[PDB]
Structures are given as structure tokens and as C-alpha cells.
Design a binder for this molecule. Structure first.
Ligand SMILES: [Cu+2]
Ligand SMILES: [Cu+2]
Length: 440
């Protein structure tokens, strides 16, 4: 219908159930004017979008048709770590059925991807990822109902010989970024808007690339973070999305025209090669070059909707019972990454907490790179970074830490069981930067 825009196929719950068999398989596909064989869920890159409502039952059978073992992480879903099991291994040729109920208060954009320790970064870079959208009753208010909605999966790629490029020694240190900077698997698509207000769900599913998002001539109005709505729209001139983060923004198209959505230059502290360089700064890579992500064409004679005056009030959380300190460190040349001086050991429990309590977590980046900290299973509220207040109230599950920054997080502990926390530059996770939390 009308102009086409590349976007993943959507699978929706029906009568309160989303039952779906999803195969993880090598798949030859068309991509950026060539043919490449990626690893995909459901024969597509990105994988299919699962769309559900609160209280729905999800029954996803993952069919491993890969040459190596794999599993799934249900990124951002506050469900049982016995379902969202970071230690599970599904051998090649076997299947596993994940069954869970969507929590009643949940809303926003989530995603799924591999979490088999040691193999995350190659598997995710090869194409294995998809989005999960939880609908909200709030989507029925006129200021959002009549917006034109789209998912934008931000995911870069690099190809060599018609397959995902191999990880190099520098990739294990810096995280791998690709030369093909894609939106929904397409190179610089064009979105011909048919409404003047857009609602864009944004997902950074890249291994390591950061997207400093800016739309030409337009602010963004942030209405949702990783794990739920803000309390009211927040206008920003630009929006930094670290790996694993999601956001939902409203765009209000004022004038006709063609506007670029760009990822503006951002320096995440990646390191370059040789120790010599010209004479200035020798071996930091420096800021990313700007990238055009997509072209946005405004409709004829645009008149946008008013912004909603309110969204979702954020629950007051109880007083915390424990303070934890988690210090991130790195040894760049060995490409090894630590939390409180240790690398991940799946046989080691690093933190022991109580169900139905709130903790404060102080996460300190004592490295020189940005590290985006992710905690499975338990969404958190960011109170402050660097001793200054966070700009909004919303559930998050990834918080970006620049070099030297300390984040203070309010972490309500929900489901019992053993789960993990890790950097979501997934190369760093594979090379050490993960620990184990047990709730009882
Ligand atoms: Cu994730
Ligand atoms: Cu990291």
C-alpha cells in the first residue's frame, strides 16, 4: 500500500497466544546490491518482529540449524531467568521452546539475540537478531494512535567473500563495526511519510557502533526508553543510542522536503593501530565519520498532531536495602575485560541478592572506552551519572558509561534465579566483561 519502506515482517499474538517456530539458519540474501549468506532467524535479516500485548503467552520454539550451539536472550524482558537462561546451550540440530507470559505493566520495544558465551559477537554480527514489541493501552490515545509508526533496526555489517567479515584481533579489543551502516537491513532507505507525526521505534542492534541520532531541521520527542514509557515527552536535538539500547520518539514534520536522519560523529574511545601517528593524536581512532541512515520525505502540506501531555507515571520505588559497587576495567592489548578485577566464570556467583528488595548499584567505568552496562531480567532506574541527575524517569536495561563515569542505578530484584550482567559491546562480554547475579 503506497510507498514501500523496508521493515521486518511482523508476527502477532492471536487470542492471547504467540506460538511460533523460528529456525536459526544460514541464509543467502540480497543486501546493499549484493548477495551474502548471513545467519538469520526465520530467513530474514533482521529477524521477524514479534508483536504482543501484556498478559499474552509467548511460545517460541528456536530450531538450531547453525553449525554451532546457540541460545536466545530475551533482551529487556522482566521474565524468569529459568526461561531467559544465559547458560542454556542448544546443540546444532536441536530445538528449545521458550514459554513465558508478558507482564501486565510492560510496554515498549525489546529484542532477541544469541547469548552463548564466547560466541555472542560472531553470531550477532552475522545477522541473528529481531525485535519484540509490547503494545500498550497508551497507544490508543489520539496523539499516538494517529501517528505513523515504524520500527528502525540500526545494525551495521561488513562482508568479505559473500559472508560476514571475520573478527580480527582489533575487533576483540574495540568491538567490531562494519562499513555497511544499515536500517532494517537496507542501505540508506527512503521513508515517504504519509502522516505529519511519526512514531519511530529505534533499536541499536549493532555489536559496537554508536548512533548519535539527529534528524535534519527537526528535534526528536522522546516518549520511551529501553523498557517503558517516559512520564511525558522530552524534546531533544539529538539522541545517543548505545549498543543494545532502544528508544521511541515522535517526529513532527513541519515543512515539506527531504530530511536526512544521520548518525553524527561520536568518539567512543576506540583505539587505532601502531603506536605512532602523524604527530597529533597517534592511535585513538577518534570520532566516527558521519553516516546517513535514511532519507525522510515529509507529506504534502504537513500539519502534525499535538504532543501528548502525559504518558506513564513512573512507580515510586522503595528505599534500597543494599549498595553494590561494580568497577569496569580493561587490558586493551590482551583484549581482556574485567568487573571488580575478574573475568566471567559461569561457575562463580559474584552477587547474591534478595527477591522483593531494591538495591542501588554503583557502576564505575575505570576504562578509557565507553562501556554500555546491561543487566538481564531486572529492569532498573538510572538515578545519576557522574554525580548529576538522569534527564528522565523510565525503565532502562542498558546504561552507557563514558570513561570515568559512575552510574547510580535503582535495581528492584524481581524473579528468583541466576542471571548475568555484562557490557553490551558484545566482544567485551565474550572477552571477559560479565558477572553472575543470583536472586533468592
Ligand atoms: Cu542484548
Ligand atoms: Cu565494554
Amino acid at each position: 500500500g503506497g510507498p514501500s519502506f523496508p521493515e521486518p515482517k511482523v508476527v502477532r499474538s492471536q487470542g492471547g497466544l504467540l506460538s511460533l517456530k523460528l529456525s536459526a539458519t544460514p541464509t543467502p540474501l540480497a543486501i546493499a546490491g549484493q548477495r551474502a549468506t548471513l545467519l538469520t532467524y526465520g530467513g530474514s535479516f533482521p529477524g521477524p518482529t514479534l508483536r504482543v500485548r501484556p498478559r499474552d503467552t509467548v511460545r517460541l520454539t528456536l530450531e538450531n540449524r547453525l553449525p554451532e550451539p546457540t541460545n536466545l536472550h530475551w533482551h529487556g524482558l522482566p521474565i524468569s531467568p529459568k526461561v531467559d537462561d544465559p547458560f542454556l546451550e542448544i546443540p546444532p540440530g536441536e530445538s528449545w521452546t521458550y514459554e513465558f507470559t508478558v507482564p501486565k505493566e510492560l510496554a515498549g520495544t525489546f529484542w532477541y539475540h544469541p547469548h552463548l558465551h564466547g560466541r555472542v559477537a560472531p553470531q550477532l554480527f552475522a545477522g541473528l537478531l529481531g525485535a519484540l514489541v509490547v503494545e500498550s493501552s497508551l497507544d490508543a490515545i489520539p496523539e499516538l494512535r494517529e501517528a505513523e509508526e515504524h520500527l528502525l533496526v540500526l545494525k551495521d555489517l561488513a562482508l568479505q567473500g559473500g559472508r560476514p567479515a571475520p573478527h580480527t584481533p582489533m575487533d576483540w579489543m574495540n568491538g567490531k563495526e562494519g562499513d555497511l551502516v544499515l536500517v532494517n537491513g537496507a542501505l540508506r532507505p527512503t521513508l515517504v511519510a504519509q502522516k505529519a507525526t511519526l512514531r519511530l521505534r529505534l533499536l541499536n542492534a549493532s555489536n559496537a557502533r554508536y548512533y548519535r541520532l539527529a534528524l535534519q531541521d527537526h528535534p526528536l520527542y522522546l516518549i520511551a526508553a529501553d523498557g517503558g514509557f517516559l512520564e511525558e515527552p522530552l524534546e531533544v536535538s539529538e539522541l545517543l543510542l548505545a549498543p543494545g539500547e532502544r528508544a521511541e520518539v515522535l517526529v513532527r514534520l513541519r515543512k515539506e522536503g527531504r530530511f536526512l536522519l544521520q548518525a553524527l560523529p561520536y568518539d567512543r574511545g576506540a583505539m587505532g593501530m601502531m603506536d605512532m601517528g602523524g604527530m597529533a593524536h597517534a592511535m585513538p581512532q577518534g570520532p566516527s565519520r558521519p553516516e546517513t541512515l535514511l532519507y525522510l520525505i515529509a507529506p504534502k502540506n504537513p500539519k502534525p498532531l499535538p504532543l501528548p501531555k502525559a504518558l506513564s507515571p513512573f512507580p515510586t520505588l522503595p528505599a534500597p536495602v543494599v549498595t553494590r559497587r561494580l568497577v569496569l576495567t580493561e587490558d586493551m592489548m590482551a583484549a581482556r575485560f574485567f568487573i571488580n578485577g575478574q573475568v566471567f566464570d559461569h561457575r562463580r556467583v559474584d552477587l547474591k541478592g534478595q527477591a522483593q528488595t531494591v538495591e542501588v548499584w554503583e557502576v564505575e567505568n575505570q576504562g578509557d572506552m565507553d562501556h554500555p552496562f546491561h543487566l538481564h531480567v531486572h529492569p532498573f532506574q538510572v538515578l545519576s551519572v557522574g554525580g548529576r541527575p538522569f534527564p528522565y524517569r523510565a525503565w532502562k536495561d542498558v546504561v552507557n558509561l563514558k570513561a570515568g563515569e559512575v552510574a547510580r542505578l535503582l535495581v528492584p530484584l524481581r524473579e528468583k534465579g541466576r542471571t548475568v550482567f555484562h557490557c553490551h559491546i558484545v566482544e567485551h562480554e565474550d572477552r571477559g566483561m560479565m558477572g553472575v547475579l543470583e536472586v533468592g
